[PDB]
Design a protein around this ligand. Structure first.
Ligand code: MG
Ligand code: MG
Ligand code: MG
Lengths: 184, 129, 150, 81, 97, 63, 155
């Protein structure tokens, strides 16, 4: 049961999330063909600077469409039973290094496997329910580089409390500073 | 047609400096334009600059502190050797003490003084003072 | 602008910033795909299919709804034409002008326009031979050219 | 004026501007849900539909092509999006 | 309009070209529509019309000679009469022209 | 032959043998390409995507 | 070149000093001599199992590759076993600090072990004077894809 929905052996912590999945599936009207064949890869744990922790779920790339249909209900229920946590869904997208001049020819790297595209794709899946409506990059006079993300004001009530945790995870997985702002 | 997007960007900045404006819009915001502006930003010739990401090629708004006299390009990007760097700085810069010839080099885009410290040389992009 | 005119009009379509759109669309991506094929069975060009989907349906763009572009779908489904659409419409226009020029010798404006159209034909065909869409030695004959547009 | 905020123009200024000349270009067109008089079927219609869009019930006209926005056929009901 | 419907039936449907095949198709009842060029001889035209009256099949009069008719069906030989054995995706039969 | 440049019978015979060799080589590589795409892709997509690609991917390893 | 009348001449074409003994019958029916030209150029399989002679071939003939290794674009294959390659280059003019396009046509002897067309990028190697103008032999050809797959008729 647990190993069915988990697709890996280590470690202890995600088994509870696997235990959370098998016990939240007592919602049979929606479980059929919308919650059962949907298994994830791994859990990452990231400390939010505000005094809480972030839960990152690593998803197979051709499984995202399943998770997105049930993401809003799965997130709110998982957060409810796992208070003092903010849970997100991140696709496991392989990044290939840029070929060097002296390097030998592997097959041509697709644009989906570039570091820039994956990081932009990380950001889109990070803030899933609302649509990104504009990105800015502030090249600070001291040499820094702060990216700014604009969000469409619809449905932002589901992500207001998670904005700081969004910055913590993205800075953890990319090493790049980022801020959010919702035009209205 | 648009042959040099860098020349278009620096021309917009020059016309903004002459009119006394403290901001200017730049389209279509290449990597060379970002790299050229970062050298300007490093030496205090410009202030902040932000990159509007439309999905076409990007736009840039640069904050101008009024400390910049001129920033041109050198088209074509002539091949510059180590001995030829001083000749270019004599021709384009007002004084030996300040101003910078900007070069594109395999070590990266840098000013002419940083090119001497790393002992690298390449093609000339422009100048700033 | 205007390769063969003094015009400088812009007159373009500003497509949305969103690549997933518009969240009110409920039709399946596959549902659009065999609707594209259905219109292609009807003989419509990829431009005409895109216009009809935009108007009658709510398909803003086939690329932001399906996985890829309309001509790519037609080629994947095996409905690509012998020559590309824009080249076909240029030769169709040149056939009309040459047919008009046969009855109107004294239409020297039409003679001038025909040179402009055939300049666009030869430029476009050179690109299509370069990008290997068209076979090498493919040539707009200008005499038997009405065969490939009828 | 020599000092202005190019990143945050007033929303009235961008409304007056051309669709290609805004800070990020975007369409000023939209889509419509039209109520044909004969029945209660929903046919999505583009604002600049430029063709006589038809439903399956009233197979004459649901909108009329013009130089700009399409002209809905004078007896229908519509809502945006 | 007419030339695109003729183009679509050639690419997607069944047809036959020429006088001896059109008469044979009319005699067998397998034709749904015959198209006759403008410069078709009136004795041939009146005889193809008369078989089609017996076959009770529609006849379309092509504005253009055998050269224009041959071009309109994707051929580069002269075609005097075209019979549509059955249309493919073309609406040439359904449309009144 | 109605044109010039077939100087005699032998010149045309050599041209025919050369033309037959070139056409046969072009025909052989065209069928070799056609037999390659049918055998290695069309048949492989028919069977090596349905019968066993849904066996070792996610179903039997779900146990 | 395993066919098309190897012995099409007045003289019996053969590799010199390679003796095909008619008493002992080795299971090959033709003793074929070959070598590797060196400089990391693999001897083609067509030269291994072919029946041509070509005393000017760099793998089966009497000529050795030594000197300069060049690269050019084939512009003519009309001669028998000889091609012309185009070597393009930029000539620097110091006064204007700029370059100009320049080219040289180099006649090259091509072995029947290779099949070159007009437009193939070919690597040639310096040899002894083959003829009045030829001082090079083809040692490598770079016809990989050609992009002609999409240039065919569709269904
Ligand atoms: Mg012009
Ligand atoms: Mg021009
Ligand atoms: Mg313009």
């Amino acid at each position: 049961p647990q190993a069915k929905i988990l697709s890996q052996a280590p470690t202890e912590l995600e088994l509870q999330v696997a235990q959370a999945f098998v016990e939240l599936e007592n919602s049979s009207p929606e479980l059929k063909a919308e919650l059962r064949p949907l298994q994830f890869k791994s859990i990452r744990e990231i400390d939010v600077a505000g005094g809480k922790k972030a839960l990152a779920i690593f998803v197979p790339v051709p499984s995202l469409a399943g998770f997105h249909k049930v993401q809003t209900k799965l997130t709110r229920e998982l957060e409810k039973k796992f208070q003092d946590r903010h849970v997100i869904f991140l696709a496991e997208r392989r990044i290939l290094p840029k070929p060097s001049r002296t390097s030998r020819q592997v097959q041509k790297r697709p644009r989906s496997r570039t570091l820039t595209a994956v990081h932009d794709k990380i950001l889109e899946d990070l803030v899933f329910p609302t649509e990104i409506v504009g990105k800015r990059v502030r090249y600070l006079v001291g040499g820094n580089k702060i990216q700014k993300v604009l969000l469409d004001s619809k449905d932002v009530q589901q992500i207001d409390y998670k904005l700081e945790s969004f910055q913590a995870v993205y800075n953890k997985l990319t090493g790049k500073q980022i801020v959010f702002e919702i035009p209205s | 047609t648009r042959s040099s997007v860098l020349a278009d960007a620096l021309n917009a900045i020059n016309n903004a400096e002459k009119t006394g404006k403290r901001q200017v819009l730049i389209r279509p915001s290449s990597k060379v334009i970002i790299k050229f502006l970062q050298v300007m930003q490093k030496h205090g010739y410009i202030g902040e600059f932000e990159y509007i990401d439309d999905h076409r090629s990007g736009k840039i708004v640069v904050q101008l502190n009024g400390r910049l006299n001129k920033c041109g390009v050198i088209s074509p990007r002539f091949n510059v050797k180590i001995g030829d760097i001083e000749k270019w700085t004599a021709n384009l810069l007002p004084a030996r003490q300040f101003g910078y010839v900007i070069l594109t080099t395999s070590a990266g885009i840098m000013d002419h003084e940083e090119a001497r410290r790393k002992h690298v040389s390449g093609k000339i992009l422009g100048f700033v003072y | 602008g205007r390769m063969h005119s003094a015009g400088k009009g812009i007159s373009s379509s500003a497509i949305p910033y969103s690549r997933n759109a518009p969240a009110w669309f409920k039709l399946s991506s596959e549902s659009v795909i065999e609707q594209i094929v259905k219109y292609a069975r009807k003989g419509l060009t990829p431009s005409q299919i895109g216009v009809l989907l935009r108007d009658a349906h709510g398909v803003t763009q086939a690329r932001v709804i399906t996985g890829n572009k309309i001509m790519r779908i037609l080629k994947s489904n095996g409905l690509a034409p012998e020559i590309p659409e824009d080249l076909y419409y240029l030769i169709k226009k040149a056939v009309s002008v040459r047919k008009h020029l046969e009855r109107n010798r004294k239409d020297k404006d039409a003679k001038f326009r025909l040179i402009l159209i055939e300049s666009r034909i030869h430029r476009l065909a050179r690109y299509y031979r370069t990008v290997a869409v068209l076979p090498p030695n493919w040539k707009y004959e200008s005499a038997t050219a009405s065969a490939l547009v009828n | 004026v020599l000092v202005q905020d190019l990143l945050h123009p007033t929303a009235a200024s961008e409304a007056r501007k051309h669709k290609l000349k805004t800070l990020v270009q975007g369409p000023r067109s939209y889509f419509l849900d039209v109520k044909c008089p004969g029945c209660l079927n929903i046919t999505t219609v583009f604002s600049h539909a430029q063709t006589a869009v038809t439903c399956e019930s009233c197979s004459t006209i649901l909108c009329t092509p013009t130089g700009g926005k399409a002209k809905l056929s004078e007896g229908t009901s519509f809502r945006r999006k | 309009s007419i030339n695109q419907k003729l183009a679509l039936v050639i690419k997607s449907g069944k047809y036959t070209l020429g006088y001896k095949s059109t008469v044979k198709s009319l005699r067998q009842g397998k034709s749904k529509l015959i198209i006759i060029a403008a410069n078709t001889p009136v004795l041939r035209k009146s005889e193809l019309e008369y078989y089609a009256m017996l076959s009770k099949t529609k006849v379309y009069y092509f504005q253009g000679g055998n050269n224009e008719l041959g071009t309109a069906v994707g051929k580069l030989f002269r075609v005097g009469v075209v019979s549509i054995l059955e249309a493919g995706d073309s609406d040439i039969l359904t449309t009144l022209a | 032959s109605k044109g010039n440049a077939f100087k005699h019978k032998r010149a045309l015979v050599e041209h025919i043998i050369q033309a037959k060799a070139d056409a046969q080589r072009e025909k052989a590589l065209n069928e070799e390409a056609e037999a390659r795409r049918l055998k290695n892709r069309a048949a492989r997509d028919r069977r090596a995507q349905r019968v066993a690609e849904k066996r070792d991917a996610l179903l039997k390893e779900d146990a | 070149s395993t066919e098309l009348t190897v012995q099409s001449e007045r003289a019996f074409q053969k590799q010199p000093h390679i003796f095909n003994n008619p008493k002992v019958k080795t299971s090959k029916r033709t003793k074929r001599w070959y070598k590797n030209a060196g400089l990391g150029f693999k001897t083609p399989k067509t030269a291994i199992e072919g029946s041509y002679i070509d005393k000017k071939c760099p793998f089966t003939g009497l000529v050795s590759i030594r000197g300069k290794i060049l690269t050019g674009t084939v512009v003519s294959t009309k001669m028998h076993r000889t091609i012309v390659i185009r070597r393009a280059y930029l000539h620097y003019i110091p006064k204007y600090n700029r370059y100009e396009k320049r080219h040289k046509n180099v006649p090259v002897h091509v072995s029947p072990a290779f099949r070159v067309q007009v437009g193939d990028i070919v690597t040639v190697g310096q040899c002894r004077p083959i003829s009045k103008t030829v001082r090079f032999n083809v040692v490598k050809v770079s016809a990989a894809a050609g992009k002609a797959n999409k240039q065919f008729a569709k269904f």
